[model samples]
Target: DVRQEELGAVVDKEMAATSAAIEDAVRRIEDMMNQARHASSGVKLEVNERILNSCTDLMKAIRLLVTTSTSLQKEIVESGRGAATQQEFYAKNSRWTEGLISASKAVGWGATQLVEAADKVVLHTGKYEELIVCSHEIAASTAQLVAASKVKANKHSPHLSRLQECSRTVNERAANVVASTKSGQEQIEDRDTM
Candidate 1:
């Protein structure tokens, strides 16, 4: 493992910081999502199905967006790295690359925190306002990644369009999550069907 270094102090002084901060975030984000799901299951509470399903959709969309974003990142490097190596290409574009890393961290944290908000709501201890706020954080961070991705992507690249579609899919699911939160809350409040 001594020789496994791809980015380090060799890239940029700032890169040293970004590299430290961006360690396997994509994977850890998925881990955080899974943790949230399991934690919810382990908790002794019953949330509405619609809200549960919408939350699942939002997480899935976020997961798929990361996959698609990674795909487009590959496309970007392959399309633009004329003679330079992968590290050289990314290391040279420190500004945009750092932006990507920051966005990724935000998305990861948003998903992680949103899960807590969801669990709280199900327990009748959280405001829909809090859950909805976390939802917006997730959505906002997702847009943050897309914004940085578009900065260097080709206008006509196939993956770019795919990324956009995934982004839209995320927003749709986010809206669903917001809507379902409201519906579920209303039904929870002395409105249960016989």
Candidate 2:
């Protein structure tokens, strides 16, 4: 009971933190959208729209990923622990637990920084290239989550399959931000021809 209690508590806390980070980014995106809508014109407005849109989509993917990963975790704990208590399984597979914890932190932390980077770009106080790095970092972070999730799940698990799809979706969405950010900057630079 002690191990089970500790395991659940730790995991629940991580999930709560994950949701807060993702939602915080979503709210920040909403604010960025409003800021974009209210200020600027022409190329700047159009670019802001595209960038924010991709960010919105990225957040959606990450949210889906968070939910799916939780589902898979439940499946793993239920099936994997078997003859043993949940905490026994957790202790036996401590490495998997560590990976899960690491990936979870990476995901939540990645989004926080990504949102901040986008915030800077939206405010015109930061370089567009920053978005590129954050986008890629998130891709890796989500992929880390997927890798950790699949360790206990078999290839045939429906939850496992879709977790991978969601992981890929996050990557694609992040890439969209990267490309969209590029498009806007090129156009913005054109107006300043020397």
Candidate 3:
């Protein structure tokens, strides 16, 4: 009984920490993006690439951990061993860590696209349109992930709200970019960079 309480408490602490870490990473990504948008240099490209690479790594880890956690949960549910078995169970909670990782990755990808597009604004406004599309992709993926996972039973609505917010943001950004690019211009012939 005492140990179970302790474990629960520990889990809560870790969850809080995980949430904080994800939020911090998201803020950093956004900051980088804002900087890149105005600066428009190779440095922006470097930052965008770095964020994409990091996000990809995070996504891979998230997928792995989600699989592992699902497996472990099935094993526990099937076995019907109560908290008494907690001690014998392994504490490989990479899944929990990976959830945050995945969330951060989604945000990072969104930021990366924005940075890339804004950097190329001088050369081609098409970059902006591409960024917006990429952002929508990220938002959609994020929504699907949350829905598929069926996470945080009590906070389901909030999670969905966040997903919707991201989706809306993506659409607005993309529309703005495309509209600006098309201002007072006639349709051009098919080009590689459309």
Candidate 4:
């Protein structure tokens, strides 16, 4: 009993820390992207876009963890101290932590990818296609995550509408990027033929 409770408390502390780290990383990404948007450098903008996409994936994963934790905590609380209820509580709690840890690992791996992409950008120039590819991947990944979030929120989750809106916004942005890329390609082809 003591050990289970102790593990629960440790998980809570780790969850708090994980949340803080994700938030901090998000803020830093925003600040950097904002500066890049205002700066007069094409490379800065491209690099920022890649980073943005990578971080968006991380953000989605973090949001999933937050939602899962909130739902499972509610379940844990509503169930009482009876043996059956305790089993239910532990089951739900274990699932929540298991899911959270998996998501955290994914975020960590995504972060590593982001760092590697940034490094490559710095070491080379004119990799605009690579940047666009990264953006598309990010957009696709975000859409998938949001869709899954909605499914998870299908029952009594207050975040359902919010997740839907997020999905819509990201889809629109991805569509815009795709349209812009298409036209840019057309312009390049026209110039080459001329």
Best by lDDT: 2
- State the lDDT of candidate 4 residue by residue for 1-194, as single tens digits: 22443444544554566456556646655555555565534544554465555545545554454445445444433443356454344354564444444444344444344434433443344343554554456445545444433333343444455545655665555455445544554554565575
Clashing pairs in 3: none
TM-score of each: 0.74, 0.90, 0.36, 0.46
What TM-score does candidate 3 get on C-alpha atoms?
Answer: 0.36
Model 1: lowest-lDDT 10 consecutive positions: 1-10
Please give the clash total of every predicted structure, in order.
0, 0, 0, 0
Worst 10 residues of 3 by lDDT: 184-193
lDDT of every predicted structure (CA atoms): 0.66, 0.83, 0.41, 0.48
Give the C-alpha miss distance for residue 144 in model 1, angstroms.
Answer: 1.0
RMSD of each: 6.6, 2.7, 11.2, 6.5
Where's the lowest-lDDT run of ten residues in candidate 2? Answer: 1-10
What is the descending TM-score order? 2, 1, 4, 3
Report the C-alpha lDDT of model 2 over 35-116, residue by residue, as the tens digit: 8766677778788878988998899889999889888887788887889876667767777776777788899999998998
Query: In model 1, which regions exceed 4 Å deviation?
Result: 1-47, 156-158, 192-194
